[PDB]
Amino acid sequence: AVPNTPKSSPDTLAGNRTEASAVSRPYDKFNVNYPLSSPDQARTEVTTKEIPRPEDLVDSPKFPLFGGSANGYMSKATRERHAITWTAKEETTFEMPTSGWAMMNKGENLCYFRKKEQCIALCKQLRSMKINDVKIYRLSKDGTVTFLHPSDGVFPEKVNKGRVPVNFRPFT
Amino acid sequence: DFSKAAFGSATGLVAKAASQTTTAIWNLHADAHDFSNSSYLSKQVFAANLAHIGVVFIWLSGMHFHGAYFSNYLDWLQDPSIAPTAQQVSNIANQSVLNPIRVTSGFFNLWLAEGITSTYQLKVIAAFGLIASALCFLGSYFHMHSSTSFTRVLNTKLTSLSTHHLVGLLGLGSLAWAGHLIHISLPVNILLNAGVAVPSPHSLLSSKAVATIVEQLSFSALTSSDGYVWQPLVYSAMHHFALALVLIVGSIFLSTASNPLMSFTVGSSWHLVLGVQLFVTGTASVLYAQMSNAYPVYPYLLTDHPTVVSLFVHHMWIGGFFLVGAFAHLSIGLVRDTLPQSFSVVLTQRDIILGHLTWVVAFLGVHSFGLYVHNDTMQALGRPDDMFSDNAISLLPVFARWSTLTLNSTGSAVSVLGVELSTADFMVTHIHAFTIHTTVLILVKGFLYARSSRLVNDKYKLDFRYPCDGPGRGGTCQISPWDHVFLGLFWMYNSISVVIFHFFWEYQSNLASIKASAGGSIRALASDFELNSINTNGWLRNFLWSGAAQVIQSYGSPLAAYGLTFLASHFVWALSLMFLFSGRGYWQELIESVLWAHHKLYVVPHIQPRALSITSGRAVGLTHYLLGGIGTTWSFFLARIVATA
Amino acid sequence: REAPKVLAGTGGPLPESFWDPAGFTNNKTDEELLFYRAAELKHGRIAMAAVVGWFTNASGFHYLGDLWLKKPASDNPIEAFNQLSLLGVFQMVFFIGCLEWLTTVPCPPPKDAPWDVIGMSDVLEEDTDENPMAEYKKIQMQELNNSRLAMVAIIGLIVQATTTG
Amino acid sequence: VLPYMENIPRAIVEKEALEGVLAMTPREQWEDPPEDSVLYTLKVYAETYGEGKATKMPWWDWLYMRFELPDANEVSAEKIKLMEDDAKIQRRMMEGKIPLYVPILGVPIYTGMTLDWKPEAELFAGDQIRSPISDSRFAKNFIGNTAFYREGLENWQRGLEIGMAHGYFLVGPFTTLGPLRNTPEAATVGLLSACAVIGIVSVGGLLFGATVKPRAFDKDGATAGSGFTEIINWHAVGGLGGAGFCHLLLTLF
Amino acid sequence: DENSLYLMGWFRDYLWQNCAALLSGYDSLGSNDLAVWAWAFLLAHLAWATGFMFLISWRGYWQELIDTVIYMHLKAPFFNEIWSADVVTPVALSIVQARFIGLAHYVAGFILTYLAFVVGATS
Ligand code: CLA
Ligand code: CLA
Ligand SMILES: CC1=C(/C=C/C(C)=C/C=C/C(C)=C/C=C/C=C(C)/C=C/C=C(C)/C=C/C2=C(C)CCCC2(C)C)C(C)(C)CCC1
Ligand SMILES: CC1=C(C/C=C(\C)CCC[C@H](C)CCC[C@H](C)CCCC(C)C)C(=O)c2ccccc2C1=O
Ligand SMILES: CC1=C(C/C=C(\C)CCC[C@H](C)CCC[C@H](C)CCCC(C)C)C(=O)c2ccccc2C1=O
Ligand code: SF4
């Protein structure tokens, strides 16, 4: 719909969001190994086939029982998306990070959010409800998927091998 | 045992080293009535309510005691035009100037409406009020310590509670008051207005008095019963009888089988009930404030102008405070509930509702204050014909000037209440609407963005009252529902201050206009409000600066107390500015230096001095701001309306 | 004789009370019967609004015309309309013409429901048995019954006036 | 059922009341109800009273029990369980289709229609929600047929139409409600002011096209913001035209 | 020498007394040469209270409100095609910026109020 959402594609409305962020904010860049801490840290790779962009999913079976809300991300106004892929043991209710309530599926579940903070809040809520394997992904403008949160497979609360200290200052 | 547990909070405070700080004391005060969720929460709430009822009974007993002993109530009965004073002031220091304090609470008019003619009756009422307070304290004790859990009253026994309140409390109280009116408040006022002496009130319940002296049931009695001070009591008695009948009939003719609190926890249910109750009480207070001067109901009430002004302003302030507290407790109930799925439609239309209200507030503010600033600019530029006034571009409130309808045996209130409105009324009413909308915007935003928001996505994990989430995301200060209530209290203060300013200026303008003389019948505009309340300069000159002469020239007069409270209110209001503008960290470092000074002299307090927390500092600043502003308006209004009326 | 199934139990003394006592339904295609329902609903909505306008004009709530005439307008809605300047009457005609144009050229109504000029059938689901609060057919019948009643009520008002005063 | 909910005397609780309490309480909640639940107090009174247990109780304790326990009708009536089941089915459905209330006199009044609030394309999109004001066919074909969106219109046509509308509107609030209201040249001054406002907003639109370059109207190839800039230029032209037409209709007639 | 001992003197005889002519800069009767200074008096009070706004209310509230306003803009017709909030994103003033701007309004109203009062009193 044209009054509900702008008629132009998100890329058309974005204009030159890239090549201007590199100019407006030349400091805003990710390090060579963003989700991880060391170059030799496996760096599991996922593609759009595994976690597709939300505009390519309509009535997906992995979506939870969500009725839609005005508090979701800005389609056609933002292109970055964060996705959560967690597997349930039973169908129960949970709070969406954007307010409102959704009901989890019996098996696989998949949600899309704009900010990573919403995904991390949902992960905290789910882990408080005894849920493992909560994987958080990031969707870029061109569809490249970056795997986040349990980046090396082990949650950051638990120390794991192969994790080089970062921003560690050897004094008080 | 119980005495040991009375200071149990202090014992717990000193038990752990983490609670050996002044911040622990301030938390102990802030979390005093915040009854935590437990098996005895409902007992605690009900007992606290009964204790408050006992406190109010103590207050009523004290007021009747002052009326009995420290008031010129009998002299006021002999001459209602005299100043009602009910607070003697002893000769200590040098305060003897204000020894008779003109009380403006309307207790004299109330007691006259109750048929009270002797100070012995006031003594009896004070004694029975003390007895009732003692009974309420006994009942509150009992319920807190030995009674039912009361946990079923809001979910299970809500039908019984609502039906009892509908029939017994409300209807039977209205019926009993109608009986009291008809039997002792009408006859006593008849015998006082006629000046034929008043017998004992019980002698009116004899079936041989005027009840059977004449059986005529209309406006005809001994000699000539033409007292118009008496008719409002007749109308009140008829209203109470009709209200009792309709309440009793409709209570049994109502479903009442719909409790929306099934999905809420007991604590959240209590908070939501408190919020809706506060909304109802606040709107009732505002309605009574309007109706007090809209309709005469107490004997010799309209004549006593300070009483009318005080009743209006006090009830407007109480209504505004309770309306804000309504949204405060709605936010508390929403954020403290585990599964508050009931507000799903509004939490999913969060941004839609908030943004439409934002546009409404922006539109109203720009339009109303732009009318005011445009009038200011045009009058400054010497362009009175370009202003917004009756002699210029006229913003006549047409929707106000129509209430005509088919009669069907009606009268009086079938019109605009016999008052014509002008451009000034239109503009000030739109200012009122805008300020109310902004207060509602802040409160509704606090309610909606209570569990989550686009900025912080786990605000429900932060509970109701938190200072911030941090300086991140650009800064997240004042996101809590508590902080939204904190800002909404300022905007309620602004709204109610403008409302009472409008009422006070209109009241003084009407008093001056009716003081035409008798021959002067072209009031033109005159109507100082209608002619000058169109500019901000008009207000600042002809209302604030003009009426401040009474309160600032009160030294050496009985209103010197009002002058001193005016000054103290300004002082407290600037101290509020101190608390609101500053921050916790600086004061913490200052206290660190002061505490070093203490340690240098072996003083070393162990309750470690900590400055007020961020939320505590905001609350102290808001309390001082409200106190200072409301006290300034209180002193100003009372001095102006007592000296000049 | 039963309903033509394109109307399908949508009126009468009861909802399934196909009432036509004139043969205005037989041998008529579904488009024509949909047109009949659209005309009935438009006439209704216009009436239902006109009755409220009449009773709010005959009750003294006649601003915007109190100001235009610069004097209190007549309570009688026919005389009140006659008091209006031809500029105002033709402005009303032009606005209704613009509204009718809107619902034909740029915003044509749904083919299967020409009465749905707002296109409400694109956001509402239906009345279903899983819905405990399903009342869409009930509110459709409320609209139709109040439409049919106000269609004769407004004529009663108009012909009662201008012939009795 | 559970052993303690068997042969409970009517004095403690009615049979219908017990059935209603069980109906409104989750099945897993039994055998260990929470302290604040009705079922917990009903259980506590179920023991120590009935069959071989204590058959009598003091009057004060009887009053306590009566206050703390339901009384079947109007509290645990079958209609109340029906309403609770309806409410839970409603909340299940709103995760999906939402019933439509409208706030009338400040209180939400149910209409009878149920919306499709769930977005058509992206479930978690915050701006793809469906409302009759923004998703009904009238809205789609009204905003879609406006000059800014109407199919078959060149950029200059959109600009000209929007400008004509804006210019004809803007002459209004200036001829009357202005400094030179009661003057013979009120219409001319209003026309000049409307043309000035059209020019200022057109300069603003040119500024937007030069800075943001919206690119939503550009044809193939071309340059970023060419379509929007053409729209704004023809909006200026149409604004002048519509303002002149309004001034003409004011001077005449 | 007598009324400066007590602060009600500082109000009545200084501020309330010396504002009599300034407020009459413009009224229903007309406007004189002090009209500009009464207008500046009001303007300075307005600036001072806007500083009150920036000092009392802090960021988070305003950031959420601005987020909702951005939602209204992005959902508004005829403008989502043109403004995607990517260019000069509207965010609430930072805490330091807000404190400075509130202080600036406070002192601007301070200076202009006292200048207008001095002119209206010593004219
Ligand atoms: C029926 C009325 C009512 C009731 C029963 C409650 C009950 C409650 N409120 Mg509440 N509230 C109300 C009205 C009410 N409120 C209104 C009208 C407002 C808007 C102003 C609020 C705003 C509000 C906020 C913002 C908060 C509460 C909170 C609370 C809870 C804890 C209260 C506490 O510990 O305070 C203890 C008692 C005090 C702090 C009293 C101290 C004195 C106050 C601050 C100033 C009084 C100054 C005085 C009038 C002037 C002095 C005289 C002068 C001459 C010197 C409790 C459930 C808190 C909570 O967490 O809830 C869960 C909370 O954060 N309320
Ligand atoms: C916001 C409140 C407000 C309002 C309503 C007015 C109104 C007015 N001012 Mg004014 N003014 C204000 C604030 C306001 N002022 C302030 C704060 C100042 C101080 C800077 C001034 C300073 C000022 C001066 C110095 C002068 C005026 C003048 C005027 C008059 C002519 C203005 C003009 O040309 O209109 C321009 C109007 C428009 C361009 C139209 C805007 C409004 C349209 C109709 C909105 C439509 C929205 C639409 C319905 C949306 C839905 C569309 C959808 C259905 C498709 C007019 C009576 C002049 C005068 O003397 O006249 C008496 C004049 O010389 N003003
Ligand atoms: C009332 C109403 C409405 C509506 C509103 C509106 C929106 C209005 C508007 C209106 C308008 C707004 C209109 C307009 C018109 C315009 C015109 C009419 C124009 C014209 C122009 C022209 C014609 C021009 C021409 C030219 C050119 C083109 C250029 C050159 C020059 C010339 C001049 C040639 C609604 C539905 C909402 C609802 C309620 C009712
Ligand atoms: C001053 C100040 C403090 C310091 C306040 C403290 C340490 C409170 C302690 C003050 C004492 C308790 C004052 C005691 C009362 C006074 C002596 C006045 C009352 C009695 C007189 C009238 C006689 C804060 O902690 C703070 C925190 C956040 C924002 C702003 C501020 C702030 O402005
Ligand atoms: C009102 C308010 C805002 C909102 C105010 C904002 C966002 C600034 C207002 C901008 C004014 C209205 C000008 C808007 C832009 C103009 C068109 C000028 C543009 C100038 C640039 C081109 C340089 C805050 O961001 C804030 C932050 C922290 C504490 C308190 C507050 C606060 O009180
Ligand atoms: S200034 Fe204070 S309230 Fe604001 S973010 Fe920083 S610590 Fe929190």
Determine the 3-state secondary structure of D125 from DSSP. Answer: strand
Q: Which residues pair with C16 in a beta bridge?
A: C11
The helix, strand and coil proportions of chain D, stated in percent and rounded to the nearest 5, come to 55, 5, 40
Enumerate chain E positions whose Cβ falls within 8 A of a Cβ in A.
71, 74, 77, 80-81, 84-86
DSSP letter for B544, please: I
| Strand ranges of the sheet holding A81-87, from the earlier edge strand across to the other edge | A108-113, A81-87, A135-139, A145-148
B244 touches B172 (CB < 8 A):
yes
Rounded to whole angstroms, the Cα distance separating D130 from D133 reads 9
DSSP string, B612-637: PPHHHHHHHHHHHHHHHHHHHHHHHH
Q: Which residues pair with B388 in a beta bridge?
A: B393
Output the residue whose Cα is nearest ligand 1's atom 31. B34
Closest ligand, as measured to the CA of C94: 3
Encoded amino acid at C148, one letter: R
Rounded to whole angstroms, the Cα distance separating B447 from D103 reads 17
**Beta carbons within 8 Å of C79's beta carbon, 6+ residues apart:** none
DSSP letter for D75, please: T
Structure-block tokens of residue C19:
């009432």
Nearest CB to D214; choose among E74, E75, E82: E82
Q: Do chains E and C touch by CB distance (3+ pairs < 8 Å)?
A: no
Q: Where would I find the H helices in B515-613?
A: 528-532, 536-539, 546-552, 560-581, 584-600
B133 touches B55 (CB < 8 A):
yes
Rounded to whole angstroms, the Cα distance separating C24 from C4 reads 11
Tell me whether residues C60 and B399 touch, CB distance under 8 A: no
Interface probe with B: pick from C63, C64, C70, most Cβ of B within 10 Å:
C63
Output the residue whose Cα is nearest ligand 3's atom 40. C95
Of B431, B541, B540, B567, nearest to B494 (Cα)?
A: B431
For residue D35, the distance in angstroms to the closest alpha carbon of chain A comes to 23
DSSP string, C54-110: HHHHTTT---SSTTTTTSPPPSSHHHHHHHS-HHHHHHHHHHHHHHHHHTTTTSPPP
| Cited resolution, angstroms | 2.9
For residue C125, the distance in angstroms to the closest alpha carbon of chain D comes to 7
CA quadruple A149, A152, A157, A163: dihedral positive or negative? negative
Of B34, B41, B31, B35, nearest to B266 (Cα)?
A: B41
Q: Give D189: exposed, middle or buried? Use CB within 10 Å, 0-12, 13-18, 19+.
A: middle
Rounded to whole angstroms, the Cα distance separating B610 from B588 reads 6
Q: Buried (b) or exposed (e) across B617-638, using 16+ Cβ within 10 A?
A: bbbbbbebbbbbbbbbbbbbbb
B511 touches E88 (CB < 8 A):
no
Atom of ligand 4 nearest to the CA of B583: 29
Determine the 3-state secondary structure of D12 from DSSP. Answer: coil
Nearest CB to B348; choose among A100, A117, A118: A100
* Chain B partners (3+ C-beta pairs within 8 A): A, C, D, E
Report in angstroms the alpha-carbon separations of B623 from B120, B490, B572, E102: 40, 10, 9, 21
**Beta carbons within 8 Å of B486's beta carbon, 6+ residues apart:** B478, B618, B619, B622
Of D210, D207, D189, nearest to D199 (Cα)?
A: D207
Rounded to whole angstroms, the Cα distance separating D14 from D66 reads 11
Rounded to whole angstroms, the Cα distance separating A115 from C63 reads 53
B124 touches B581 (CB < 8 A):
no
Of B464, B499, B493, nearest to B481 (Cα)?
A: B464
Tell me whether residues D83 and B263 touch, CB distance under 8 A: no
Rounded to whole angstroms, the Cα distance separating D251 from D244 reads 10
Rounded to whole angstroms, the Cα distance separating B585 from B376 reads 43
Q: Which residues pair with A109 in a beta bridge?
A: A86
Rounded to whole angstroms, the Cα distance separating D183 from D185 reads 5
Determine the 3-state secondary structure of B231 from DSSP. Answer: helix
**Beta carbons within 8 Å of A19's beta carbon, 6+ residues apart:** none
Other beta carbons within 10 Å of C53 = 16
| Token pair 């109480």: residue | B318
Closest ligand, as measured to the CA of E58: 5
Reading phi first (left if > 0) and then psi (alpha if -120 to 50, else beta), residue A159 is in beta
**Beta carbons within 8 Å of B347's beta carbon, 6+ residues apart:** A69, A71, A99, A100, B448, B451
Tell me whether residues E81 and D127 touch, CB distance under 8 A: no
Nearest CB to B405; choose among C59, C63, C66: C59
- Tell me whether strands B100-102 and B85-88 are parallel, antiparallel or unpaired: antiparallel
Q: Give B32: exposed, middle or buried? Use CB within 10 Å, 0-12, 13-18, 19+.
A: exposed
Rounded to whole angstroms, the Cα distance separating D29 from E6 reads 72
Rounded to whole angstroms, the Cα distance separating D159 from D161 reads 6
**Beta carbons within 8 Å of D148's beta carbon, 6+ residues apart:** D158, D162, E78, E81
**Beta carbons within 8 Å of B610's beta carbon, 6+ residues apart:** B21, B22, B23, B588, B591
Angle at A131 between CA A127 and CA A134, to 5 degrees: 80
Report in angstroms the alpha-carbon separations of B534 from B377, B522, E44, E120: 11, 21, 19, 22
Is the CB of residue D165 below 6 angstroms from any atom belonging to ligand 3? yes
* Chain-centroid distance, C-alpha B8: 34
**Beta carbons within 8 Å of B74's beta carbon, 6+ residues apart:** B118, B119
Q: Buried (b) or exposed (e) across D91-111, using 16+ Cβ within 10 A?
A: bebbbbbbbbeeeeeeeeeee
Q: Buried (b) or exposed (e) across B49-86, using 16+ Cβ within 10 A?
A: ebbebbeebbebbebbbbbbebbbbeebbeebeebbbb
Of D181, D215, B463, D253, nearest to A12 (Cα)?
A: D215
Structure-block tokens of residue B21:
């700080």
Torsion of CA C117, C120, C126, C130, to 10 degrees: -160
A82 touches A121 (CB < 8 A):
no
Output the residue whose Cα is nearest ligand 5's atom 14. E90
Query: Which of E53, E55, E62 for mutating ligand 5's site (highest number of atoms within 8 Å of CB)?
Result: E62
Is the CB of residue D241 below 6 angstroms from any atom belonging to ligand 3? yes
Q: Give A56: exposed, middle or buried? Use CB within 10 Å, 0-12, 13-18, 19+.
A: exposed
Chain E residue closest to A8 (CA)?
E81
Structure-block tokens of residue D142:
């009204």
Determine the 3-state secondary structure of B176 from DSSP. Answer: helix
Rounded to the nearest angstrom, the distance between the alpha carbon of E95 and the centre of ligand 6 is 8
Q: Where would I find the H helices in chain E?
A: 7-9, 17-18, 20-23, 35-56, 59-75, 95-122
For residue E84, the distance in angstroms to the closest alpha carbon of chain D comes to 9
Contacts 24+ apart (CB under 8 A), B554-559: B554/B639, B554/B643, B555/E8, B556/B97, B557/B97, B557/B643, B558/B97, B558/B98, B558/B99, B558/B100, B558/B101, B558/B102, B559/B98, B559/B638, B559/B639, B559/B642, B559/B643
Other beta carbons within 10 Å of B607 = 14
Encoded amino acid at A35, one letter: P
Atom of ligand 4 nearest to the CA of B612: 25
Phi, psi of A81 (to 5 degrees): -135, 150
DSSP run (H or E) holding A112: strand A108-113
Nearest CB to A71; choose among B339, B350, B460: B350
Rounded to whole angstroms, the Cα distance separating B464 from E54 reads 24
Nearest CB to E82; choose among D126, D146, D208: D208
Task: Show residues of chain A in contact with D139, CB under 8 Å.
Answer: 1, 3-4
Rounded to whole angstroms, the Cα distance separating C156 from D13 reads 61
Query: Which of B579, B595, B618 for mutating ligand 4's site (highest number of atoms within 8 Å of CB)?
Result: B579
Rounded to whole angstroms, the Cα distance separating B590 from B597 reads 11
Task: Show residues of chain C in contact with B399, CB under 8 Å.
Answer: 63
Rounded to whole angstroms, the Cα distance separating D172 from D176 reads 7
Q: Buried (b) or exposed (e) across C94-125, using 16+ Cβ within 10 A?
A: eeeeeeeebbeeebebeeebbbbbbbbbbbbb
Query: Which of D234, D245, D253 for mutating ligand 3's site (highest number of atoms within 8 Å of CB)?
Result: D245
B312 touches B503 (CB < 8 A):
yes
Task: Show residues of chain A in contact with E71, CB under 8 Å.
Answer: 70, 74
Structure-block tokens of residue B412:
């009086």
DSSP letter for E93, please: P
Rounded to the nearest angstrom, the distance between the alpha carbon of B20 and the centre of ligand 4 is 19
Rounded to whole angstroms, the Cα distance separating C43 from C146 reads 11
Q: For chain D, where are the E strands, in sequence order?
A: 99-104, 107-114
Q: Which residues pair with D104 in a beta bridge?
A: D107
Angle at A136 between CA A133 and CA A138, to 5 degrees: 155
Rounded to whole angstroms, the Cα distance separating B423 from B429 reads 10
Rounded to whole angstroms, the Cα distance separating B203 from B183 reads 10
Which experimental method was this entry solved with? cryo-EM
Q: Of chain B residues 403-442, which have a CB less than 8 A from chain C?
A: 404-406
Rounded to whole angstroms, the Cα distance separating B492 from D115 reads 36
Rounded to whole angstroms, the Cα distance separating B481 from C91 reads 50
Contacts 24+ apart (CB under 8 A), A158-166: A162/A38, A162/A40, A162/A41, A162/A42, A163/A37, A163/A38, A163/A41, A164/A37, A164/A38, A165/A37, A166/A37
Q: How many alpha carbons fall within 13 Å on the CB side of residue D122?
A: 25
Q: Give D115: exposed, middle or buried? Use CB within 10 Å, 0-12, 13-18, 19+.
A: buried
Contacts 24+ apart (CB under 8 A), A105-109: A105/A61, A105/A62, A105/A63, A105/A64, A105/A65, A108/A61, A108/A62, A109/A62, A109/A63, A109/A64, A109/A84, A109/A85
Q: Do chains C and B touch by CB distance (3+ pairs < 8 Å)?
A: yes
Whether D6 and chain C come into contact, CB under 8 Å, resolves to no
Q: Give E64: exposed, middle or buried? Use CB within 10 Å, 0-12, 13-18, 19+.
A: buried
Of D167, D164, D166, nearest to D156 (Cα)?
A: D164
Output the residue whose Cα is nearest ligand 6's atom 2. B477
Of B428, B579, B576, nearest to B503 (Cα)?
A: B428
Q: Which residues pair with B85 in a beta bridge?
A: B102
Interface probe with D: pick from C91, C111, C122, most Cβ of D within 10 Å:
C122
Whether E17 and chain B come into contact, CB under 8 Å, resolves to no
CA quadruple E90, B457, A13, D161: dihedral positive or negative? negative
Determine the 3-state secondary structure of B539 from DSSP. Answer: helix
Chain A residue closest to E83 (CA)?
A13
Rounded to whole angstroms, the Cα distance separating D128 from D120 reads 7
B634 touches B569 (CB < 8 A):
yes
Q: Where would I find the H helices in B395-455?
A: 423-448
| Token pair 């977005």: residue | D119
Q: What is the 3-state secondary structure (H, E, C) of B487-538?
A: HHHHHHHHHHHHHHHHHHHHHHHHHHHHCCCCCCCCCCCCCHHHHHCCCHHH
